[PDB]
Amino acid sequence: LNQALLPTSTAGSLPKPLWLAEPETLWSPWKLQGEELITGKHDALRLSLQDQQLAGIDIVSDGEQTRQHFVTTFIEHLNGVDFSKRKIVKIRDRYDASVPTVVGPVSRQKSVFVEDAKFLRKQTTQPIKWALPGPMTMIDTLYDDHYKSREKLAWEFAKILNEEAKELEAAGVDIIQFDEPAFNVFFDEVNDWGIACLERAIEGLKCETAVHICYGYGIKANTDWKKTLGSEWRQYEEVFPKLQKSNIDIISLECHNSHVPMELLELIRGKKVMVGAIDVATDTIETAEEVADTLRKALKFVDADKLYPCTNCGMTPLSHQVTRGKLNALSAGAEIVRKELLALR
Ligand code: MET
Ligand SMILES: [Zn+2]
Numbered sequence: 001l002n003q004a005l006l007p008t009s010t011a012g013s014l015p016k017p018l019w020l021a022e023p024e025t026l027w028s029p030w031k032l033q034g035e036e037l038i039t040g041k042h043d044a045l046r047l048s049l050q051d052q053q054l055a056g057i058d059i060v061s062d063g064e065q066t067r068q069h070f071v072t073t074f075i076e077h078l079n080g081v082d083f084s085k086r087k088i089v090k091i092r093d094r095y096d097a098s099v100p101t102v103v104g105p106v107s108r109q110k111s112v113f114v115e116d117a118k119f120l121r122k123q124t125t126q127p128i129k130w131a132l133p134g135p136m137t138m139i140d141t142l143y144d145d146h147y148k149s150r151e152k153l154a155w156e157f158a159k160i161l162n163e164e165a166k167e168l169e170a171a172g173v174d175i176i177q178f179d180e181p182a183f184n185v186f187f188d189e190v191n192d193w194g195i196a197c198l199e200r201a202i203e204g205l206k207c208e209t210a211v212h213i214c215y216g217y218g219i220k221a222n223t224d225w226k227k228t229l230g231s232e233w234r235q236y237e238e239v240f241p242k243l244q245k246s247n248i249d250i251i252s253l254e255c256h257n258s259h260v261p262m263e264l265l266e267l268i269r270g271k272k273v274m275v276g277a278i279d280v281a282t283d284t285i286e287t288a289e290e291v292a293d294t295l296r297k298a299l300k301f302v303d304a305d306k307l308y309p310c311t312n313c314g315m316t317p318l319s320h321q322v323t324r325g326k327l328n329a330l331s332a333g334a335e336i337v338r339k340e341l342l343a344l345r
Contacts, residue, residue, distance in 0.1 A: 002127060005341065006295070006309055006334045007058035009274060011212055011252060012131040012177065013070060013314030014048050014063035015323050024317055026217065027069050027098070041066040042119055049123055055324065056331030059127045059175065059308075064316060066116045070179055071133040071141040072100055074113075078160065080106035080146065087143035093185045095221045101143045102153065108160045114167045121172035130173045131212065132161055134180035135197035136189065151193050158200035169207045177210040177252065178202070184213055187238040195242045202247060210250035210274065211243065214313040215258065218281035226281070233259045240267035250274055254312035256286070256294050265301035273302045276312030277333060278326045283318070285325035291333025304341055309334040 020040050021028035032040045048063030067073035076083045085101040117130055133141070135154040147153040165176045178201060183190050202209045213236070215229075216222035236253065243251060244267060252274035254260065265273060277294040278286055295309055309330060315323045339345045 003058040005304065006307055006338045007127075008309045008331050008334050009057060009059040009129055010052075010061060010278075010311045010327065010330075011214070011276075011280075011314045012061045012064050012129070012179075013316035014051065014061075014065070015316060015318060015320045016063075016065055017044055017047060020044050020065075021068075024319055026219065026317060027072070030068065041116075045116065045120055046123060049120065051320075051324070052327070053124075053126075055327035056335075057327060059129050060120075060124060061129050061131065062113075062116060062120055064131070064314065066113070070131060070314065071137055074133055074164075075100055075138060075142055077108075077110070077112045078106050079109055080104040081142075089143050091141050092182065092216070094225060097141070099142045102146050104146050106146075106153070106156050106160065108163050111167055112164055114164070114171050117168050117171040117173050127174040128172065129175040129177055129210070130168050131177040131179050132164060132168075134178040134182070134194075134211065135161060135201060136182040136186065136194045137180050140182045140186070150189065154193065154197045155200070158197040161201040162203055165201065165205060169205055173207060175208045175210055175250065176202075176205060177212055177250075178248075179212045181212075181214055181216060183211070183239050184215065184235045187235075190239050191242065195239075195246060198248065199246060208249040208272075209247070210252050210272075211248050212252035212274070212313075213239070214252075214254040214276070216281075217313055218279075218317050223281050229259065231259060232261055234261065234264070236260060236264045237267065240264060244268050244271065250308065252276070252308075252310055255298065256291075256312055257282070258312070262297050262301055265298065269301070270306075272306045272308055273298070274308040274310035275302070277309050278311040278330050280311055280313045280315050280318065280326070283322050285322065286329040286333070288329055288332035288336055291329050292336040295333060295337045299337075 044065035
């Protein structure tokens with residue numbers, strides 16, 4: 001039996017084993033190749049699942065253990081993409097990254113994560129949440145040397161995502177999450193076509209869908225950026241009204257230690273809300289009570305049966321020890337509030 005009230009989850013990614021990849025980095029090269037890597041990825045999935053279960057996470061992910069990066073791995077499996085043709089581009093309208101190049105017409109040929117999801121589905125009866133990159137974030141994490149159009153390419157990616165997502169649903173995934181950190185930047189594009197591309201990505205799915213929009217991984221570039229954002233981070237106000245009208249079921253957001261006004265959650269009243277109650281941009285471990293405090297504040301704007309305690313973003317850049325402490329705090333804080341709501345203490 002699954003957790004009916006305040007079920008916990010994370011944004012998706014968790015640290016990989018030392019023998020599989022370099023610690024505490026983004027885009028780590030794989031330390032195994034060939035059949036050893038095939039086995040290692042699945043063993044890492046099993047170990048990550050166990051870590052999530054031990055920490056009391058109710059809705060589990062792959063720990064993103066089988067991918068190098070939450071955006072570029074998916075892109076690299078597509079036709080029309082040159083994996084080893086790298087360019088430095090400014091991503092998120094702000095900072096530089098080494099990204100793959102679109103060299104021709106894009107298409108999905110073989111499935112990407114479906115065999116992984118079938119494998120994970122056999123390991124547990126708990127709900128499974130699998131993240132894919134959203135169409136906008138995809139076009140913002142590559143160099144387009146063919147379409148020469150963010151919108152045209154994003155449309156093609158929406159179609160491809162829909163194919164992958166539908167097959168992940170067939171594999172038994174319960175929640176398909178689309179990672180759209182780009183939505184906290186490109187407001188005009190979100191309004192003109194980003195929502196439409198997200199709708200195309202989710203068309204015909206019967207499982208629950210989520211969109212994740214945050215202020216990024218725990219890296220210096222982002223913590224520096226946060227220091228410039230002022231007293232109120234109101235980026236969500238630009239996109240929440242349209243997300244409210246969309247067919248997305250769950251909105252995953254950053255909240256803990258942020259300056260996002262909590263009353264912005266009223267704009268999505270009726271949606272399920274994955275409320276980030278863990279700051280993945282500090283190594284300081286939250287107390288259970290600090291997590292509980294964020295969840296209590298969120299209950300002013302979200303019905304208890306729609307509140308999904310979560311992390312502000314993924315944890316692949318953190319150490320295993322920090323991650324363990326944070327996930328334990330998340331589950332412990334959720335339980336504090338769950339017990340209050342049920343008059344158990
Ligand atoms: C910068 S958005 C990253 C989201 C991704 N699903 C993760 O958990 O890492
Ligand atoms: Zn994020």
